């Protein structure tokens, strides 16, 4: 019975399909709609296509980056076993490529396939650093962060902007919209790091603090040598973790990431104000959206 | 710069390419050009596309059963870690799709997309029946094999009729030979592996012992009272050994191979008389065994 | 060394670590070094023996570099490796040469021979490590250290990725494998890596022969003893 075949493959993906993600990509899409003003028939499927990609990347991450739990409920890895979760994610992406090809075919979608292949180059750098111990630079961290999170918003804008409702010559609107998209994706990562360090993820990843500190001569040796024990033992200790947290509080680390966050906000608001003067009306959605990012 | 970031994605794929590939799918396609007679500039391209799909599938496979040594060299799982192998396998299959989405073909986008989704259903089942120990039946084993191995040759053929003078009164009589050839390999390939612990390594010569109506119920309970309490006992190691030897299941597999042939050599003949052109190539495939 | 670089059986006897315990061997070693400084000071103090102690402090900077790379996984350069080997092996030969001169003939100038002798010591000390490599790679040291072969390939774009990821599995798992080491040994023999050190050894000999001939004209006689040490390398 096909009802059984189609439901043993799709079974894992349904486990995180109904979790309360409380995402922001949906809220971001309906705010650009105030400008682009496209038919409602579209604005349904696009959320139903960008959501598939997000949940699929989540399955592949909670395996690559070995974690036991995420919030409350158990990880998709421990429930359905390792072998099935990978195949279920790999299959689900193929649906998303088809659901996109379904309608957009005129304007040359070869620029919507060229925007998915990069989302895997990004994580390849990430799994290469955490494994081979190579310390990052400063520009390399910002470049990697664009490849992984911000490129997903790039899909959303390039599909929204395909509906030139008897307007939008885009001659002056192509480049300008993209920088607005880029800045928010970069912001939505660093902002998570400041809330995260107010630990428990010292099992390999590379935050902004650690990359800023290891470039200040004081304690440069100490921090480098402590982290090496970690990847050798798989998790630091309950004691050694306290040492890095107190260094952060002394070299004034929790105050330099704050000083970078306030920089991107003034820049993006300037961009929106430049959009608000280019033959447009108020957009109280974007100007209320920034508050929902801590 | 950029060349650095580009060589980490393509590191595992370039490692499995250097293995000594068996090389059968690259000769079967060359034999069909006798009838269809497509240009060379495409035969080289279509071969490349099907090649990456099979190498990308296996990287997931040999990892889905953790084995430090597959043949000669170490396993990709034990050189590039595990997180790297999966995230490069995924990228590879998507890249193959993009090469089909171009001048390769214009209108039949749904045709090639659907034959790729199916390949994963026949592989999800394999993982299910392995993870729950629920041994299968012969009536469903043929389904899996045709949904997992044959679904590769099918794509190779459906794209070769899109370039080539005959008409649409032929394609119905070509898919039949494919599924027969695809099935016959898995059984013969498994046979070569044969000529104990289970852990999901099926074959025709193994699903037949658990269903031989003589001693069926007696065997079905020797396996249990076991795996969850200990590997085996000391007389059971001979018990499972001598039970399979008695009826010589290994010869019932011999009988089933001898039937596809007498159907096979009559399947080339049907097209052999449809198109007035001999085939010195289909006859040479049988030298494989 | 056989404690910091935890090793098994060496030449027929077990490592001094396992017999007397770890804590006891360290204290016995640190005591003997200070005992040797006192004998050195004793024989002479004129001509400034503040340069025989200033040249021992470096022998510990040398080993510190090696134990930091093997620990923190940082790949070496090629020029940087030559400095590490100079500090550790060559400096002991330098001590022996710097003490003989301080009391030899009390007549010879030596003014124009001080720099010349140091040039001879450096090349011989450097040579004895690169030549020692050939015997280790005909293995058992792929647990963190960096031979000359490994430094050449990881700087050649082909197969650089493969080996770098293989060795990383080691320091995380504590030892590579019995099979993967056969993989690493098989890579080396293909790109002719064990042939790039050979092409350096034949170069360094021509330098030593030229150097002694430059000394052989500076009021000196043949040395069938010095020229008998180099002959034992076929």
mmCIF file of N, CA and C in Angstrom, chain A residues 4-6 8-9 60 63-65 78-84 86-87 90-91 93-95 97-98 101-102 110 113 116-117 120-121 123-125 127-129 131 140 143-144 147, chain B residues 2 4-6 8-9 60 63-64 79-84 86-87 90-91 93-95 97-98 101-102 109-110 113 116-118 120-121 123-125 127-129 131-132 143 147:
data_model
loop_
_atom_site.group_PDB
_atom_site.id
_atom_site.type_symbol
_atom_site.label_atom_id
_atom_site.label_comp_id
_atom_site.label_asym_id
_atom_site.label_seq_id
_atom_site.Cartn_x
_atom_site.Cartn_y
_atom_site.Cartn_z
ATOM 1 N N UNK A 4 1.534 3.394 3.044
ATOM 2 C CA UNK A 4 2.532 3.014 4.032
ATOM 3 C C UNK A 4 3.933 3.393 3.576
ATOM 4 N N UNK A 5 4.226 3.201 2.289
ATOM 5 C CA UNK A 5 5.533 3.564 1.751
ATOM 6 C C UNK A 5 5.802 5.055 1.911
ATOM 7 N N UNK A 6 4.847 5.889 1.500
ATOM 8 C CA UNK A 6 4.979 7.337 1.577
ATOM 9 C C UNK A 6 5.008 7.854 3.007
ATOM 10 N N UNK A 8 6.637 5.934 5.787
ATOM 11 C CA UNK A 8 7.833 5.534 6.518
ATOM 12 C C UNK A 8 9.036 6.389 6.131
ATOM 13 N N UNK A 9 9.085 6.863 4.884
ATOM 14 C CA UNK A 9 10.129 7.792 4.465
ATOM 15 C C UNK A 9 9.930 9.163 5.098
ATOM 16 N N UNK A 60 20.037 17.966 9.375
ATOM 17 C CA UNK A 60 21.404 17.642 9.000
ATOM 18 C C UNK A 60 22.413 18.229 9.968
ATOM 19 N N UNK A 63 22.918 16.260 13.627
ATOM 20 C CA UNK A 63 23.702 15.051 13.442
ATOM 21 C C UNK A 63 25.179 15.365 13.270
ATOM 22 N N UNK A 64 25.510 16.226 12.304
ATOM 23 C CA UNK A 64 26.876 16.719 12.140
ATOM 24 C C UNK A 64 27.455 17.238 13.450
ATOM 25 N N UNK A 65 26.747 18.158 14.100
ATOM 26 C CA UNK A 65 27.186 18.751 15.361
ATOM 27 C C UNK A 65 26.504 17.968 16.474
ATOM 28 N N UNK A 78 18.299 10.680 18.113
ATOM 29 C CA UNK A 78 18.103 9.599 19.069
ATOM 30 C C UNK A 78 16.802 8.835 18.861
ATOM 31 N N UNK A 79 15.806 9.439 18.217
ATOM 32 C CA UNK A 79 14.502 8.797 18.093
ATOM 33 C C UNK A 79 14.485 7.820 16.925
ATOM 34 N N UNK A 80 14.703 8.317 15.711
ATOM 35 C CA UNK A 80 14.586 7.490 14.519
ATOM 36 C C UNK A 80 15.881 6.792 14.145
ATOM 37 N N UNK A 81 16.933 6.951 14.928
ATOM 38 C CA UNK A 81 18.219 6.404 14.565
ATOM 39 C C UNK A 81 18.941 7.265 13.544
ATOM 40 N N UNK A 82 20.258 7.078 13.488
ATOM 41 C CA UNK A 82 21.099 7.935 12.661
ATOM 42 C C UNK A 82 20.855 7.696 11.179
ATOM 43 N N UNK A 83 20.772 6.429 10.773
ATOM 44 C CA UNK A 83 20.790 6.092 9.356
ATOM 45 C C UNK A 83 19.590 6.648 8.602
ATOM 46 N N UNK A 84 18.431 6.730 9.245
ATOM 47 C CA UNK A 84 17.233 7.174 8.543
ATOM 48 C C UNK A 84 17.165 8.690 8.416
ATOM 49 N N UNK A 86 19.377 10.982 7.896
ATOM 50 C CA UNK A 86 20.121 11.551 6.778
ATOM 51 C C UNK A 86 19.348 11.377 5.477
ATOM 52 N N UNK A 87 18.839 10.171 5.228
ATOM 53 C CA UNK A 87 18.123 9.920 3.983
ATOM 54 C C UNK A 87 16.838 10.729 3.914
ATOM 55 N N UNK A 90 17.809 14.286 2.900
ATOM 56 C CA UNK A 90 18.272 14.370 1.521
ATOM 57 C C UNK A 90 17.115 14.312 0.539
ATOM 58 N N UNK A 91 16.088 13.529 0.857
ATOM 59 C CA UNK A 91 14.953 13.415 -0.047
ATOM 60 C C UNK A 91 14.107 14.675 -0.023
ATOM 61 N N UNK A 93 14.843 17.792 0.314
ATOM 62 C CA UNK A 93 15.349 18.908 -0.479
ATOM 63 C C UNK A 93 14.886 18.791 -1.921
ATOM 64 N N UNK A 94 14.813 17.561 -2.437
ATOM 65 C CA UNK A 94 14.463 17.372 -3.839
ATOM 66 C C UNK A 94 13.032 17.817 -4.097
ATOM 67 N N UNK A 95 12.147 17.686 -3.106
ATOM 68 C CA UNK A 95 10.808 18.238 -3.262
ATOM 69 C C UNK A 95 10.858 19.747 -3.407
ATOM 70 N N UNK A 97 13.163 21.769 -4.619
ATOM 71 C CA UNK A 97 13.616 22.221 -5.927
ATOM 72 C C UNK A 97 12.491 22.101 -6.943
ATOM 73 N N UNK A 98 11.689 21.042 -6.840
ATOM 74 C CA UNK A 98 10.579 20.883 -7.763
ATOM 75 C C UNK A 98 9.460 21.876 -7.518
ATOM 76 N N UNK A 101 10.548 25.079 -9.185
ATOM 77 C CA UNK A 101 10.441 24.988 -10.634
ATOM 78 C C UNK A 101 8.995 24.996 -11.104
ATOM 79 N N UNK A 102 8.054 24.651 -10.220
ATOM 80 C CA UNK A 102 6.649 24.519 -10.594
ATOM 81 C C UNK A 102 6.114 25.751 -11.313
ATOM 82 N N UNK A 110 18.047 29.398 -13.097
ATOM 83 C CA UNK A 110 19.429 28.976 -12.873
ATOM 84 C C UNK A 110 20.141 29.849 -11.843
ATOM 85 N N UNK A 113 19.142 27.919 -8.387
ATOM 86 C CA UNK A 113 19.981 26.765 -8.092
ATOM 87 C C UNK A 113 21.380 27.184 -7.669
ATOM 88 N N UNK A 116 21.549 27.747 -3.891
ATOM 89 C CA UNK A 116 21.428 26.668 -2.928
ATOM 90 C C UNK A 116 22.746 25.928 -2.746
ATOM 91 N N UNK A 117 23.517 25.764 -3.824
ATOM 92 C CA UNK A 117 24.794 25.068 -3.725
ATOM 93 C C UNK A 117 25.741 25.727 -2.730
ATOM 94 N N UNK A 120 25.853 24.843 1.168
ATOM 95 C CA UNK A 120 26.601 23.675 1.600
ATOM 96 C C UNK A 120 28.101 23.910 1.616
ATOM 97 N N UNK A 121 28.588 24.843 0.799
ATOM 98 C CA UNK A 121 29.966 25.297 0.926
ATOM 99 C C UNK A 121 30.194 25.971 2.269
ATOM 100 N N UNK A 123 28.718 25.389 5.345
ATOM 101 C CA UNK A 123 28.925 24.440 6.430
ATOM 102 C C UNK A 123 30.171 23.591 6.240
ATOM 103 N N UNK A 124 30.658 23.437 5.009
ATOM 104 C CA UNK A 124 31.872 22.659 4.810
ATOM 105 C C UNK A 124 33.074 23.343 5.444
ATOM 106 N N UNK A 125 33.173 24.666 5.304
ATOM 107 C CA UNK A 125 34.178 25.411 6.049
ATOM 108 C C UNK A 125 34.001 25.227 7.547
ATOM 109 N N UNK A 127 32.627 22.721 9.297
ATOM 110 C CA UNK A 127 33.025 21.397 9.753
ATOM 111 C C UNK A 127 34.501 21.114 9.517
ATOM 112 N N UNK A 128 35.181 21.953 8.738
ATOM 113 C CA UNK A 128 36.618 21.833 8.537
ATOM 114 C C UNK A 128 37.405 22.527 9.641
ATOM 115 N N UNK A 129 36.936 23.688 10.094
ATOM 116 C CA UNK A 129 37.589 24.374 11.204
ATOM 117 C C UNK A 129 37.415 23.619 12.513
ATOM 118 N N UNK A 131 36.966 20.690 13.142
ATOM 119 C CA UNK A 131 37.631 19.392 13.109
ATOM 120 C C UNK A 131 39.151 19.541 13.148
ATOM 121 N N UNK A 140 37.286 36.037 7.455
ATOM 122 C CA UNK A 140 36.789 34.704 7.135
ATOM 123 C C UNK A 140 35.546 34.352 7.936
ATOM 124 N N UNK A 143 32.656 36.214 6.212
ATOM 125 C CA UNK A 143 32.354 35.590 4.930
ATOM 126 C C UNK A 143 31.602 34.283 5.122
ATOM 127 N N UNK A 144 32.034 33.459 6.074
ATOM 128 C CA UNK A 144 31.351 32.195 6.321
ATOM 129 C C UNK A 144 29.917 32.417 6.771
ATOM 130 N N UNK A 147 27.504 32.977 3.907
ATOM 131 C CA UNK A 147 27.235 31.797 3.096
ATOM 132 C C UNK A 147 26.153 30.917 3.701
ATOM 133 N N UNK B 2 39.458 31.771 -2.894
ATOM 134 C CA UNK B 2 38.285 30.948 -3.167
ATOM 135 C C UNK B 2 38.646 29.501 -3.505
ATOM 136 N N UNK B 4 40.645 27.596 -2.112
ATOM 137 C CA UNK B 4 40.705 26.829 -0.872
ATOM 138 C C UNK B 4 39.327 26.291 -0.503
ATOM 139 N N UNK B 5 38.365 27.193 -0.288
ATOM 140 C CA UNK B 5 37.011 26.801 0.094
ATOM 141 C C UNK B 5 36.359 25.852 -0.902
ATOM 142 N N UNK B 6 36.831 25.822 -2.146
ATOM 143 C CA UNK B 6 36.218 24.969 -3.156
ATOM 144 C C UNK B 6 36.724 23.539 -3.081
ATOM 145 N N UNK B 8 37.517 21.822 -0.288
ATOM 146 C CA UNK B 8 37.061 21.026 0.844
ATOM 147 C C UNK B 8 35.733 20.334 0.528
ATOM 148 N N UNK B 9 34.838 21.001 -0.211
ATOM 149 C CA UNK B 9 33.602 20.353 -0.647
ATOM 150 C C UNK B 9 33.885 19.133 -1.505
ATOM 151 N N UNK B 60 26.948 7.414 0.962
ATOM 152 C CA UNK B 60 25.975 7.289 2.034
ATOM 153 C C UNK B 60 25.833 5.837 2.458
ATOM 154 N N UNK B 63 28.695 4.193 4.625
ATOM 155 C CA UNK B 63 28.624 4.800 5.944
ATOM 156 C C UNK B 63 27.433 4.279 6.735
ATOM 157 N N UNK B 64 26.328 3.962 6.055
ATOM 158 C CA UNK B 64 25.150 3.412 6.715
ATOM 159 C C UNK B 64 25.401 2.021 7.279
ATOM 160 N N UNK B 79 38.489 8.683 7.286
ATOM 161 C CA UNK B 79 39.522 9.600 6.829
ATOM 162 C C UNK B 79 39.061 11.047 6.950
ATOM 163 N N UNK B 80 37.887 11.360 6.400
ATOM 164 C CA UNK B 80 37.317 12.696 6.475
ATOM 165 C C UNK B 80 36.277 12.827 7.577
ATOM 166 N N UNK B 81 36.347 11.995 8.603
ATOM 167 C CA UNK B 81 35.289 12.025 9.588
ATOM 168 C C UNK B 81 33.973 11.533 9.006
ATOM 169 N N UNK B 82 32.896 11.822 9.727
ATOM 170 C CA UNK B 82 31.553 11.452 9.302
ATOM 171 C C UNK B 82 30.701 12.644 8.902
ATOM 172 N N UNK B 83 30.809 13.760 9.618
ATOM 173 C CA UNK B 83 30.038 14.946 9.268
ATOM 174 C C UNK B 83 30.417 15.477 7.892
ATOM 175 N N UNK B 84 31.692 15.373 7.521
ATOM 176 C CA UNK B 84 32.120 15.861 6.214
ATOM 177 C C UNK B 84 31.590 14.993 5.077
ATOM 178 N N UNK B 86 28.837 13.153 4.824
ATOM 179 C CA UNK B 86 27.419 13.339 4.544
ATOM 180 C C UNK B 86 27.181 14.666 3.837
ATOM 181 N N UNK B 87 27.819 15.738 4.304
ATOM 182 C CA UNK B 87 27.572 17.052 3.727
ATOM 183 C C UNK B 87 28.192 17.242 2.355
ATOM 184 N N UNK B 90 25.499 15.022 -0.071
ATOM 185 C CA UNK B 90 24.292 15.774 -0.379
ATOM 186 C C UNK B 90 24.531 16.785 -1.489
ATOM 187 N N UNK B 91 25.653 17.498 -1.438
ATOM 188 C CA UNK B 91 25.933 18.500 -2.457
ATOM 189 C C UNK B 91 26.069 17.874 -3.834
ATOM 190 N N UNK B 93 24.604 15.190 -5.332
ATOM 191 C CA UNK B 93 23.405 14.791 -6.063
ATOM 192 C C UNK B 93 22.707 16.014 -6.634
ATOM 193 N N UNK B 94 22.694 17.119 -5.885
ATOM 194 C CA UNK B 94 22.068 18.342 -6.375
ATOM 195 C C UNK B 94 22.794 18.839 -7.618
ATOM 196 N N UNK B 95 24.119 18.709 -7.637
ATOM 197 C CA UNK B 95 24.894 19.181 -8.775
ATOM 198 C C UNK B 95 24.573 18.383 -10.027
ATOM 199 N N UNK B 97 21.719 17.140 -10.798
ATOM 200 C CA UNK B 97 20.421 17.594 -11.277
ATOM 201 C C UNK B 97 20.580 18.809 -12.179
ATOM 202 N N UNK B 98 21.421 19.756 -11.779
ATOM 203 C CA UNK B 98 21.595 20.964 -12.565
ATOM 204 C C UNK B 98 22.136 20.722 -13.958
ATOM 205 N N UNK B 101 19.069 19.794 -16.071
ATOM 206 C CA UNK B 101 18.210 20.970 -16.215
ATOM 207 C C UNK B 101 18.661 21.931 -17.300
ATOM 208 N N UNK B 102 19.593 21.565 -18.175
ATOM 209 C CA UNK B 102 20.130 22.493 -19.160
ATOM 210 C C UNK B 102 19.863 21.968 -20.561
ATOM 211 N N UNK B 109 11.320 17.959 -17.721
ATOM 212 C CA UNK B 109 11.885 18.175 -16.394
ATOM 213 C C UNK B 109 11.242 17.240 -15.372
ATOM 214 N N UNK B 110 9.919 17.068 -15.436
ATOM 215 C CA UNK B 110 9.234 16.195 -14.489
ATOM 216 C C UNK B 110 9.646 14.742 -14.679
ATOM 217 N N UNK B 113 13.055 14.238 -12.846
ATOM 218 C CA UNK B 113 12.906 14.493 -11.417
ATOM 219 C C UNK B 113 12.190 13.352 -10.706
ATOM 220 N N UNK B 116 14.149 10.237 -9.815
ATOM 221 C CA UNK B 116 15.153 10.395 -8.767
ATOM 222 C C UNK B 116 14.530 10.259 -7.388
ATOM 223 N N UNK B 117 13.315 10.774 -7.217
ATOM 224 C CA UNK B 117 12.625 10.643 -5.940
ATOM 225 C C UNK B 117 12.352 9.185 -5.610
ATOM 226 N N UNK B 118 12.037 8.383 -6.626
ATOM 227 C CA UNK B 118 11.729 6.973 -6.413
ATOM 228 C C UNK B 118 12.930 6.243 -5.838
ATOM 229 N N UNK B 120 14.934 6.935 -3.671
ATOM 230 C CA UNK B 120 15.065 7.051 -2.228
ATOM 231 C C UNK B 120 14.002 6.262 -1.479
ATOM 232 N N UNK B 121 12.846 6.017 -2.099
ATOM 233 C CA UNK B 121 11.851 5.158 -1.466
ATOM 234 C C UNK B 121 12.370 3.738 -1.336
ATOM 235 N N UNK B 123 15.243 2.872 -0.944
ATOM 236 C CA UNK B 123 16.353 2.862 -0.008
ATOM 237 C C UNK B 123 15.908 3.146 1.413
ATOM 238 N N UNK B 124 14.832 3.914 1.585
ATOM 239 C CA UNK B 124 14.244 4.072 2.910
ATOM 240 C C UNK B 124 13.717 2.747 3.447
ATOM 241 N N UNK B 125 13.108 1.930 2.583
ATOM 242 C CA UNK B 125 12.621 0.625 3.018
ATOM 243 C C UNK B 125 13.756 -0.260 3.495
ATOM 244 N N UNK B 127 16.496 0.497 4.879
ATOM 245 C CA UNK B 127 16.889 0.912 6.217
ATOM 246 C C UNK B 127 15.847 0.534 7.261
ATOM 247 N N UNK B 128 14.567 0.526 6.888
ATOM 248 C CA UNK B 128 13.515 0.197 7.845
ATOM 249 C C UNK B 128 13.567 -1.270 8.250
ATOM 250 N N UNK B 129 13.535 -2.173 7.269
ATOM 251 C CA UNK B 129 13.575 -3.603 7.551
ATOM 252 C C UNK B 129 14.887 -4.044 8.178
ATOM 253 N N UNK B 131 16.532 -1.950 10.503
ATOM 254 C CA UNK B 131 16.486 -1.373 11.837
ATOM 255 C C UNK B 131 15.528 -2.101 12.770
ATOM 256 N N UNK B 132 14.642 -2.950 12.242
ATOM 257 C CA UNK B 132 13.639 -3.638 13.048
ATOM 258 C C UNK B 132 13.711 -5.156 12.920
ATOM 259 N N UNK B 143 10.393 -6.081 -5.363
ATOM 260 C CA UNK B 143 10.039 -4.668 -5.418
ATOM 261 C C UNK B 143 11.235 -3.794 -5.069
ATOM 262 N N UNK B 147 13.295 -1.095 -7.372
ATOM 263 C CA UNK B 147 13.155 0.297 -6.976
ATOM 264 C C UNK B 147 14.466 0.944 -6.552
#
